[PDB]
Design an enzyme around this catalytic site. Structure first.
Site, short mmCIF file in Angstrom:
data_model
loop_
_atom_site.label_atom_id
_atom_site.label_comp_id
_atom_site.label_asym_id
_atom_site.label_seq_id
_atom_site.Cartn_x
_atom_site.Cartn_y
_atom_site.Cartn_z
N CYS B 105 0.85 -1.20 0.00
CA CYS B 105 0.00 0.00 0.00
C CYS B 105 0.88 1.24 0.00
CB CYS B 105 -0.99 -0.18 1.16
SG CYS B 105 -2.06 1.25 1.55
N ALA B 106 0.84 2.09 1.03
CA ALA B 106 1.67 3.29 1.03
C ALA B 106 3.14 3.03 1.35
CB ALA B 106 1.16 4.30 2.06
#
Lengths: 195, 195
Positions: B105-106
Site C-alpha cells: 500500500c503506502a
C-alpha cells in the site's frame, strides 16, 4: 449517524473482525467494539494471537442505539458468544426491535441455530459447518441477506470484504458502498456496487 | 521453522497488518509484531481506530533471526516508518543480509523510494501513489515479487490475502500456500497456488 456494535470474545477471528470494523469506519458508520465473556476485561486475544483492545464491556453498551450487531467468527470466540446469556439476549433484542443482526463464519451455526433465534430465515456460514445449519435454511453463497428477518450472514475470512460492504449498502446506501469498494483494490469476483 | 517480523506504527492500516499476521500463523510461520512508535508504546491505534497490542518495541527485537520484515501501509503509519532511523536501518540490514523485504500500500512509495533502498527492482503500491514510484520500476499488479532483490510489494487492503499467501509461498512453499488459501473462502481473482 449510523452506528454498529461489533462484539469480540477470546478466540474471535481477527481478520473477520478487523476487516469489518475498517470498512464500516470507511463508510462513515460509528463503530463500538465490545468485549464479551471476559468479565469486563478489554484485552482480547484472537484466534491467531492478535491482541485487540475493546472499547467497553458488552454489559456497558448493550442497551445503546446501534443499527447493527456484528458477530465475528472463529470457533472458540463463537462458543463464548453462544454461552453468554447477555450476548444471546442482546441479539434477540436487536432483532425484536427491528435492527440488523450480522454474523460470519462459525457464528451462524454456533450462536444462532442452537438458540433458535431465526427459525425461518436463509443463512450461510463457514462451509465445513454446513451440516449444523438446518437444510431448508442453508445457502452456499459468499453473503446472504434475508430482508424478512434482517439477517446478514457470510462465510469466512475471505468473504469479510463482501460482508462489510453489504452492511454499508444496507445502512448508508449503495453509493457509499461503491465509494468504499473503490478504495480497496478488490479482487475480481467481489461485487463492487457500481450497478 | 520460518519467522516474520511485522512492524506496526500509529496509523498503520489494520486490515493489511492483521490479515497478514493471520495468514502467516495459519502457514506455520512464527510472527513477532514490533512497535515503531517513537516512544516505545505497544498500544497502537491504527488508521480506522482499531487498537492493536504489539509484542515488543522494535529496538528489543530488530537484531532477531527473522526471514522477512513486513511493512504494512496506511499513510500515517508509513510516514512513521520513513522517519524512524532504526526502522530504515533495519530494512537495509534485512536486504543486505539476503533476507526478504515485504511492503504493501503506502509503504513502498513512502519508505522505500525516499531512502533509495531499492534503486533497481520492480515494485507496486497503492495506485493513487503510483506517481511517487519511478516509472521504470512501477508495475500495476496485485502482488509483485522481484527475486533479484528479494522485494515483495502489493497494492492495498483488498490485496492483503494475495500478499500474505506469497509470503507463505516464499518461506514455506507452494503446498502450504495452497493449504492456507483453501481455508479462507477466497474470491476468484486471487491466485490459489494450485495447478
Amino acid at each position: 449517524s449510523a452506528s454498529a456494535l461489533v462484539c469480540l470474545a477470546p478466540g474471535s477471528e481477527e481478520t473477520e473482525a478487523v476487516t469489518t470494523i475498517d470498512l464500516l469506519v470507511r463508510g462513515g458508520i460509528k463503530v463500538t467494539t465490545a468485549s464479551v465473556a471476559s468479565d469486563g476485561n478489554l484485552a482480547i486475544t484472537c484466534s491467531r494471537g492478535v491482541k485487540l483492545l475493546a472499547d467497553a464491556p458488552l454489559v456497558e453498551v448493550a442497551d445503546g442505539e446501534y443499527d447493527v450487531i456484528v458477530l465475528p467468527g472463529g470457533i472458540k470466540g463463537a462458543e463464548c458468544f453462544r454461552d453468554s446469556t447477555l450476548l444471546v439476549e442482546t441479539v434477540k433484542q436487536f432483532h425484536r426491535s427491528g435492527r440488523i443482526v450480522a454474523a460470519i463464519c462459525a457464528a451462524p451455526a454456533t450462536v444462532l441455530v442452537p438458540h433458535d433465534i431465526f427459525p425461518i430465515g436463509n443463512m450461510t456460514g463457514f462451509p465445513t459447518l454446513k451440516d449444523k445449519i438446518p437444510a431448508e435454511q442453508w445457502l452456499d453463497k459468499r453473503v446472504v441477506w434475508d430482508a424478512r428477518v434482517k439477517l446478514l450472514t457470510s462465510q469466512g475470512p475471505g468473504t469479510a470484504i463482501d460482508f462489510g460492504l453489504k452492511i454499508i449498502d444496507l445502512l448508508v446506501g449503495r453509493e457509499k458502498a461503491h465509494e468504499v469498494a473503490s478504495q480497496l483494490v478488490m479482487a475480481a469476483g467481489i461485487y463492487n456496487y457500481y450497478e
